[PDB]
Design a protein around this ligand. Structure first.
Ligand code: VO4
Ligand code: VO4
Ligand code: VO4
Ligand SMILES: [Br-]
Ligand SMILES: [Br-]
Ligand SMILES: [Br-]
Ligand SMILES: [Br-]
Ligand SMILES: [Br-]
Ligand SMILES: [Br-]
Ligand SMILES: [Br-]
Ligand SMILES: [Br-]
Ligand SMILES: [Br-]
Ligand SMILES: [Br-]
Ligand SMILES: [Ca+2]
Ligand SMILES: [Ca+2]
Ligand SMILES: [Ca+2]
Ligand code: NA
Ligand code: NA
Ligand code: NA
Ligand code: NA
Ligand code: NA
Ligand code: NA
Ligand code: NA
Ligand code: NA
Ligand code: NA
Ligand code: NA
Ligand code: NA
Ligand code: NA
Ligand code: NA
Lengths: 597, 597, 597, 99, 50
C-alpha cells in the first residue's frame, strides 16, 4: 500500500498544533542564570556584626540608614522570599518605607521637601511577574542573562563614569556633539572615559564571552553615548524613526498617475500618518538644567519609597528631540512598545515592502493575492505589540528572581557617602573605592552641579554631594536594574520588525534636527542607511535614553536587548506551526548573522 | 529545522482515519430524550386499583380487555424491560396474544373472522434495534426526538381529526382536490380542522420550540393533507419523482448531434429508465372503499396480535397514483428507500448535474476527469441507500426505548369506546373526552362509514362503531408510533440527494395525473419548481402516505424527518475524512439554511 | 472478589466499538499486489529509441500514433504519477486527446465520423479512487488481485479468441445455443477454443495457484461462454433472477386461507413486484448486427478520447434477454448493484427465508419477534447496496495503481495492425505474433464481419480490418481492464445475499426465454437449482455480459469476483461487533467452502 | 498519609500549562456555521442555461458581464476551491480581472 | 415598522430594530450607543497631559 497521512477533525488539528508548539518550546531545553556573587559577598562593616550588608543589591523601598545601607537584613531576605513565592498576602506583609507617625499614620521622611508634600510610599512593580507562564514563546525562566558587572570591576567603573557624564551633559544638543562651542565638555567626556581601563585595554583570553562581546574600545565623538547594535554607529545619533514623519494620505501612485498629498510637507515636520489622523514626533520639554535627588536626604527618602512621581516641571509646547534630556523625557513615559509601533507605522505609510520570503508579496497579476490579516499590515501590527509582555516576564525573572542589581542612583549614593567620609579620613563602602578614585575629575564637576541644584531647591548652604543627578524626580522605577523593561521590549520589537519587513531596504533621505530651529534638516551623512540599521539604532536610542536619565547602566541595556531578541525569535518559531503557506521570515540578528524562521 | 509532517504505512493511515471519524462522532456529545409523561400519568379507573393503565402507550400484542386496555400491567413492564435489554430469551418469555385453546394451541380470538381464519400471532419488529451500534454516523442513542403530543392536547385533537378526515377521503383523487364535485367533503374537512384550536390559534411565547416549529395555521385546499417541508407547498400535491418517467436509452447528445430514443414517449407515461430495463410508476389498486378494523372485535384481535397481513383485495392492473388510498397502498409495501432511489434514477437518466462543489464536475477538456465511483452515479447510488439502516436504528430507539407512543388506531379505539359509553351515560377513557367532544361531526360521519363497512363484512346489524378506519387489514406495524420508519428514512435519503446533486436546478416541465385517464398531463402550475423542493415534497408524500393509511400522526412524521436529516449529515461529516480531494457537499437543510460538508 | 466486567456510557461504548472494528481490520494485515511485468518489458521498436512502448498498458486518452502506440512515453508516466497522487490540479495538467484546431479549439480527429460530430474528449473516471479510505471494510489497498495474463501467454490467446467468438456470435439466442440452425457457428466456436493450449492442456505442477484455479478445460456447448462460479454450470445459461418476475401483491397466506393476486400472471412475464409498483425484466433492443470501432481511424479516435457515448441505435420496445447482444446491452447502463437489488426483491417477494442462523427467524408464537431493521428486509436492502462503493475503491486500486492492463479493444488493435503488416512482410507488435497465428480462422471471419460493418458505415471500399468489434460505440469505459467494476460489485453483492438469505433454499420452477416468442417457458432442465447457485450464475451473467460487449477478459472477471467477495466478508466481520444478539451469517464462498460470520 | 500534590521542573510546568489551555479550548466543543442558501438558489435567467448565477455571492475580481453577473460560473467555483485549500499555486491559477 | 414574530430566528430577534428617530438614526445597538452624543468621547477628546 502507498504510504500516506490521514486527516482529523479541525478541532483536534488545532489542539495538536498547540501541543506541537508546546513540545517545540519544551524541547529547546533550559539554561540556568548565574548571579555575580555580590549579594552574600559584602558584609556589615561593624566588627560585632557578621550579617550581609546587601549594598550592591536592589533594596529600594526597604528602610535605609543615613549611609544608604538597609537597617535590617531580614527586610531584604523576606523581600527575596516574597519574590520567589508571589503570594499576595506575603507581599502585603513586607516592610515598605520608614517609620510612620502614630498620629497621622504618614511616613516620617528625612527631607523637608518630602514631609512638606506629605508623601506616601510606592510599592514594587510586579516583583513576581517572573513566575508568570505564557501561552506562547519561551518560558520566562528558560533563558538567562549573564552575571552583572561587580562594583569593584573596571566595567562598572566605566559604566558609572559614563552615566555621570551623561547627567552633566543633559543640556547638550545631539546635533551639536561636534560643535566647537561644546568642545571643552565633549573632549572632557571623551578623555575621561579613554582614561579608564575598560575602554583603553582590550579583553583578555579567558575573560567571559559575554564581556568580550559587550566590551567597548576607544571613545570618540562619533561613538560617544551610543549603543553597539549594528547600525547604531553609522550616520546621525537619532534613528530616522524617532524624528521623521511619514508619507501622508493623498500621496499615492494610481496606475500611471502620481497624486500628491496637500499635507505632504507634514512628512518633513515629524507628523506620522496614523491611519487618517496623526502622531507628532515632538516631545514635551522638561525644564532644562533641573535634576533630582542631588540632596542626600531627598535621595534617602526616595530609597525609602517616597513617591515623587509627577513632580517634574516642563516648558510650554513640544519640540523634535533636541537635547540628551529630551531623550530622557521621551523614555520617561513612553508605552514600552511605542517607538517600534511608531516606526512600524512610518514603514507602512512609506510603502516599505514586507519580507520578500513571505507569501503573496508579488504584484497581484502574478499571485492573485494581497496581504492584510496574514503576512500584511494587521499581522505585523499585532505581532510587534504582543511580544512586549512575553519579553517583560523574562526580564522580570532576571531583575527580581536572579540578579537584584542595585540601580545607578544607588551606586552614586555609595560613591557620594564614600567620598564624603574619605575626606574626613574614614572608610565607608570601600567596595566603591576604585570608582571614587578613578572618577575624581568627574565627581568634582558633579559636586559643583549638585550644589547649584541644592541651592536652587532652597537649601542656602547645602552639604557637599556627589550623587548621580537624576532626570526623574522619583529616580528609577520600583524594580532592580538588570535587565531593563525598555531594552528587553526594544530587543523583542525590533526583532519582529526586521523579521517581518524587507529589512535590507535602503532609506533614500537622511535627516537630523536643525541646530538653530525646531525643524528637520538634511543630514550631511554621505553613506547609505538601511531599515535594519535604523531599527537597531532606534532600539539603542530608547535603551540609552534610560541611561541618560540615570536609571540603567550600559550592560543592563545590551544584555536586555539580547534577551528580548530570544523571546521574539521563539514566538516566531512556535507560530510557524500554525500556517499552511510555504514561507519564512528572514531575520538579521544583533550578532550580524541571519536566521530563517 | 523546517516544521514537517511524516508518512506512515497505508494500513496505519486507514486505521487512524477510522479512529478520527469515531473521535469526531464522540466529540459531538449526546443529548437526552424526554417522553411526554403519559406512561405513568394515567391510572386504572377502578377505585381499588392504583396501577398505571398504560392506555396512551403502545401495547399492541399484549392482551387487552373488552375496552382495549391491557389486562395485566406486568405484561407491559416486562415488555419495557425486554426492550432495554434486547436479550432474545427474555423477549421469547414475554406474553404475546390472547389465551390459547388447550386442544389446538391456537389463539382464541374475539371475532368470527379471525377465528374462521385460524390466525396466529405476529411479534414485535426489532424491539431492541435501538441498542445496535453502527460503524458510521451518529450513534442511535446520541440524538433525540422531543416529547410526543399528549391525548389531552389541542395538537393531538387536531392530529386525530385530520387522520379521520383522510380515512373518509381515501377515494378522493389528488388532481380533483379543488374540483366542485368534491367541494362538500373538501370544505367539510377544511372547516372542521379550522374549527380546532391547534389550527386557529397561534403558538404562544414560552411554548416548546418544537411545537412552535411544527404548529400549523389556517387550513386551505392548497395545504390540505400536505406536509410543511420547504417546497411541499408549491405546485401540485405529488412530487414529480413519484409520477414521471425519465429520459430513455437512445436519447443522447453526441457532439453536435441529437439522437432520439424510439421509446422516448415512455418518459411521459411513468417509465423510469432503470439501467437498460424499466421501473413503472404505476401502483397496484387496492379495492376502493374497503377499509379495515371498523368492527371492535376485529380491532381488538388486531390489538392482541392477530396476523391479518396479506388480507387486502385488489382490482386487476395498476395506475399512476390517483387517489389518497393509492398513496396509502404505495407506502404499504415500498422498500423504505424506494422512493428516493427512484428519484435518484430519474435525476441520473435526465442528466441533472451533481453538486458543482464536488471535484471533476467540469467538462473533461478542462479537468481531465469524469466521475463514477467517487462524486458520480455509483457513489450516490450507494450513499442514498446505506443511510436507511442507520436512520432506522435511531428511530427504533425513539419508538421503543423512549416514547412508546400509541398508534392512531389505538387512539381511535379509545375515542370509540369512550363515545359508545357516553351515549349510555357512562364515562370510559375520560382522557380522550376533548377529542370526542371536538370531533363530534367527524365521528358522526365515521359511524356511518363504519356501519357500511361492517354490513359489507357480513354483519347484518352491526353495533355502532367510531373506530378510525384502517387502509391496511393489519393496521400499523408491530412497533410504536413515534417516530416513523418511513419518515426517518425519507429524511435521511432526501438529505443525501440534496447534498449530492445541484439541488438548485430548476425543473423544466411540471406534470400531474390526468383527471379522466390513467395518464400524465401538463400541470397548470405557473411558477418554478426546483430539485430540492421536489425532493422535500417526495419525503412529505411518503410520510403523509402513512398518515393517510391511518398509521402515523403529523408530529410522528415531521419529527422523524428532522431525525433522519441529522443521521445523514453525520454520515457525510465522518465520511469527509476519507477523501484526498478538495470539495464539499452543499446541503439545503429542512430549516431553510445551508451547511457545507 | 468475583471477576467482573464494567459498564461505561453509551457514547464511549459506541466509540470503543468503532475502534475495535478498526483494530480488527488493521490486525488482518496487508498483502502486496504484483503486476505481470509487461509495463517496462516492451520497448520502442525503433533502433535509436530505448524507451518503453507501454503497448500492453491501458493508455486510452493519451495521444496514439497510426499504429495505436502512444506517441510520448512521458504522457503515460505523468498519468501514472497523477494516479498515485490524486491531486486534482496535477490531473488537470495531463495530456488528454489529440492536437486541437487553433481556430475552433476542437480536437482534430482521424475519422470523418468523429470530425463530422465535432466530438470532444472524455476523461478518466476516478483515476485515484484507489487512494480513498473507507469507514468500513478492508482498506482498498490491503488486498490484491494477482498478475494479469501477458500478451504472449496461452491464457491471453484463449481469452482474446473467446472475445472475438462472442462478438461474432452476438445475434445468437441463448435458448438456441444447441439448435441445429446454429450448429455451424457454435461448433466452430467450440472447435476453435478446443484447438488452443489453454483449454486443451492442463496446468502444470509449479504454475501459479491463481492460474490453476481459473484455468478452463474442454469447451462444450454446455459451458460455452459461461463463467466458473459454482452453480453457473447447472441448468440454463441465464440466472432465474434476470428473467423471472416475482409473486405479486394480493397473493398471500392469511391463517388457513390462500389469496391469489389478480395480477398473478405478471410473475411469469418478467414483472418484479417492487413495493407496490413494478420492475420490468425486459431490456431495450440494440440494433441487431450493428457493431462499433471496426474502422482503424474511428478506433484510434476512441483510443484518443473521442466521446462516442450515446451513439447507439435501438429498435422500439423491449424484450426478455434473448441474444448475446441483449446481455451486452443490459450491462451497458445498469447501476452496478442493479442485478442483485433486483434478485433481492424477487427473493423477498417470493418469501425466500433469511439465514436460519439469524435471530428471530422462527414463527412469532415461539420467539415473540419479527424482523425488519435488523436481520430483515430493510437490513439486507441497505447492506447489499452499501458494499458496492467499498468494492469499487479496491478494484480502482488494482485497475489504476497496480496493473494498468490494456482493454480487449486495445489487444484487438495490436492484432489487427500486426496482421496487416505481416501480409506486407513487415513485423509490427511481434508481442501478439502468437495470438495472430493461433486465431487465424477467427480473424478471417472478423475481417469479413468488419468489411460489412465498414461498408454499412458509409465507407464504399474499406481497408482490411481485424479489430475486435465492440458492442458499444465508445468501447470500454475510461479506465484499465483489470479488474472490473461490474464483476467486483457482483462478487460483493452476491456474497451479501448468500450470507443474508438461506442460500440452500431450492427453487421450485425453472424458466427460460421461449425460442419463438417474447415470453418465459418452462425449462427442460431436470435437476434442482438453489438460491446460492442462481445468485452465483447472476454474478457470472453480469460479468460475462461485459466480455460479450468486448470490454473485459475472462481473468478480469473471475479475479474481480474473488476481490469483491473479500470486501463483503470484511464488512460483515467488522459489523458483527455492533450487535448484541447471538447469531451469524452462513456464507457459501465461491471456492465451495463455508464461513460463519 | 496526608493527600498531597507534587512539584515538577519549571519547564514541565510551563508545558503542562500550555497543554491545559489547549485542552480547555478543545473542551469548549465547536458549532457549525450555516449560510443563507442564496449561493445555489439563484440561477442563470437564460432559458437554455441551468447554471447558478452567483449574483448574491461576493465575486469581486472575477470577470463580470455588462449587467454585473459573472461570465463563467467555473471562475467562482475555482475561487471557492482555492479558498478551502489555501494552496498558493492554486490561488495563482485563478482568473482575476478582465481580458 | 413591524416587530419580529414568535418562531423567527433568535439572531434576527436580537438584532432587529424598531422605530427610527433622530436620536437613533444611523446608530448601532450596543448598550451605551443610544445615550448622549453620537460619537464616543474617545474619538474626539484629548487626555490629561504630562
Ligand atoms: O522600564 V526600565 O526596566 O528601562 O526601568
Ligand atoms: O414504516 V413506519 O414506522 O412509517 O410504521
Ligand atoms: O464497469 V466495468 O470495470 O465491468 O468496465
Ligand atoms: Br471539528
Ligand atoms: Br518594566
Ligand atoms: Br536564534
Ligand atoms: Br501498509
Ligand atoms: Br420501520
Ligand atoms: Br447541521
Ligand atoms: Br452517553
Ligand atoms: Br467502475
Ligand atoms: Br474468508
Ligand atoms: Br526546568
Ligand atoms: Ca500579491
Ligand atoms: Ca469532468
Ligand atoms: Ca420470529
Ligand atoms: Na562585620
Ligand atoms: Na520651566
Ligand atoms: Na525580514
Ligand atoms: Na542649537
Ligand atoms: Na384507580
Ligand atoms: Na456522470
Ligand atoms: Na448539493
Ligand atoms: Na376523475
Ligand atoms: Na528500440
Ligand atoms: Na434499428
Ligand atoms: Na446465508
Ligand atoms: Na428464435
Ligand atoms: Na435558466
Amino acid at each position: 500500500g502507498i504510504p500516506a497521512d490521514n486527516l482529523q477533525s479541525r478541532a483536534k488539528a488545532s489542539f495538536d498544533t498547540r501541543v506541537a508548539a508546546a513540545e517545540l518550546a519544551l524541547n529547546r531545553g533550559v539554561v540556568p542564570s548565574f548571579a555575580n556573587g555580590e549579594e552574600l559577598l559584602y558584609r556589615n562593616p561593624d566588627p560585632d556584626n557578621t550579617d550581609p550588608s546587601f549594598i550592591a543589591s536592589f533594596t529600594k523601598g526597604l528602610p535605609h540608614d543615613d549611609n544608604g545601607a538597609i537597617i535590617d537584613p531580614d527586610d531584604f531576605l523576606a523581600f527575596v522570599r516574597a519574590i520567589n513565592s508571589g503570594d499576595e498576602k506575603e507581599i502585603a506583609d513586607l516592610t515598605l518605607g520608614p517609620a510612620r507617625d502614630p498620629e497621622t499614620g504618614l511616613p516620617i521622611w528625612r527631607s523637608d521637601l518630602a514631609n512638606s508634600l506629605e508623601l506616601e510610599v510606592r510599592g514594587w512593580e510586579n516583583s513576581s511577574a517572573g513566575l508568570t507562564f505564557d501561552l506562547e514563546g519561551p518560558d520566562a525562566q528558560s533563558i538567562a542573562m549573564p552575571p552583572a558587572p561587580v562594583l569593584t570591576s573596571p566595567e562598572l567603573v566605566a559604566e558609572i563614569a559614563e552615566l555621570y557624564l551623561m547627567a552633566l551633559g543633559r543640556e547638550i544638543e545631539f546635533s551639536e556633539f561636534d560643535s566647537p562651542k561644546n568642545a571643552e565638555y565633549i573632549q572632557f567626556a571623551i578623555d575621561q572615559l579613554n582614561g579608564l581601563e575598560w575602554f583603553n585595554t582590550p579583553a583578555k583570553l579567558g575573560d567571559p564571552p559575554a564581556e568580550i562581546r559587550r566590551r567597548r574600545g576607544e571613545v570618540t565623538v562619533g561613538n560617544l553615548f551610543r549603543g553597539i547594535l549594528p547600525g547604531s554607529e553609522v550616520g546621525p545619533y537619532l534613528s530616522q524613526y524617532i524624528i521623521v514623519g511619514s508619507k501622508q494620505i493623498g500621496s499615492a501612485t494610481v496606475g500611471n498617475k502620481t497624486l500628491v498629498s496637500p499635507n505632504a510637507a507634514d512628512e518633513f515636520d515629524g507628523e506620522i500618518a496614523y491611519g487618517s489622523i496623526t502622531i507628532s514626533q515632538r516631545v514635551r520639554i522638561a525644564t532644562p538644567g533641573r535634576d533630582f535627588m542631588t540632596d542626600l536626604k531627598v535621595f534617602l527618602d526616595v530609597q525609602d519609597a517616597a513617591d515623587f512621581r509627577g513632580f517634574e516641571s516642563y516648558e510650554p509646547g513640544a519640540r523634535l528631540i533636541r537635547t540628551i534630556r529630551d531623550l530622557a523625557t521621551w523614555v520617561h513615559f513612553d508605552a514600552l512598545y511605542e517607538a517600534y509601533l511608531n516606526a512600524c507605522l512610518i514603514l507602512l505609510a512609506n510603502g516599505v515592502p514586507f519580507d520578500p520570503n513571505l507569501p503573496f508579496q508579488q504584484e497581484d497579476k502574478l499571485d492573485n493575492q494581497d496581504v492584510f490579516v496574514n503576512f500584511g499590515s494587521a499581522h505585523v501590527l499585532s505581532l510587534v505589540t504582543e511580544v512586549a509582555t512575553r519579553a517583560l516576564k523574562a526580564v522580570r525573572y532576571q531583575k527580581f528572581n536572579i540578579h537584584r542589581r542595585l540601580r545607578p542612583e544607588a551606586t552614586g549614593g555609595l560613591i557620594s557617602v564614600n567620598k564624603i567620609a574619605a575626606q574626613k579620613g574614614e572608610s565607608i563602602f570601600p567596595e566603591v573605592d576604585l570608582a571614587v578614585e578613578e572618577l575624581g575629575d568627574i565627581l568634582e564637576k558633579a559636586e559643583i552641579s549638585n550644589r547649584k541644584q541644592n541651592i536652587a531647591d532652597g537649601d542656602p548652604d547645602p552639604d557637599p554631594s556627589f550623587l548621580l543627578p537624576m532626570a526623574f524626580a522619583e529616580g528609577s522605577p520600583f524594580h532592580p536594574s538588570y535587565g531593563s523593561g525598555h531594552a528587553v521590549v526594544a530587543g523583542a520589537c525590533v526583532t519582529i520588525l526586521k523579521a517581518f519587513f524587507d529589512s535590507g531596504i535602503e532609506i533614500d533621505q537622511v535627516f537630523e534636527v536643525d541646530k538653530d530651529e525646531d525643524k528637520l534638516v538634511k543630514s550631511s551623512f554621505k553613506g547609505t542607511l538601511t531599515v535594519a540599521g535604523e531599527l537597531n539604532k532606534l532600539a539603542d536610542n530608547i535603551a540609552i535614553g534610560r541611561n541618560m536619565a540615570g536609571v540603567h547602566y550600559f550592560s543592563d541595556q545590551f544584555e536586555s536587548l539580547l534577551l528580548g531578541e530570544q523571546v521574539a525569535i521563539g514566538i516566531l518559531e512556535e507560530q510557524s506551526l500554525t500556517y499552511g503557506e510555504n514561507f519564512f521570515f528572514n531575520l538579521p540578528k544583533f550578532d550580524g548573522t541571519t536566521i530563517q524562521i
